Design a protein around this ligand. Structure first.
Ligand SMILES: [Zn+2]
Lengths: 7, 60
């Protein structure tokens, strides 16, 4: 699954 | 903090705890019903906020 998070 | 995961069935983005996101890699199937947050836990539920608002919250 695709995820996005703080860098 | 929060992270976001894309449902593999409807492709809406769902808010999840950042303490769990590392376990969801790109081979994993994840869908809305797997969400512990039952405001947003089936594919009929609208996405919490716009994509641009999500990216702003994440600072990306
Ligand atoms: Zn879904």
């Amino acid at each position: 699954a695709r995820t996005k998070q703080t860098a | 903090e929060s992270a976001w995961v894309r449902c593999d069935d409807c492709f809406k983005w769902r808010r999840i705890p950042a303490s769990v996101v590392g376990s969801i890699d790109e081979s994993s199937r994840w869908i809305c019903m797997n969400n512990s947050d039952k405001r947003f836990a089936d594919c009929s539920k609208s996405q919490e906020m716009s994509n641009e608002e999500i990216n702003a919250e994440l600072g990306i």
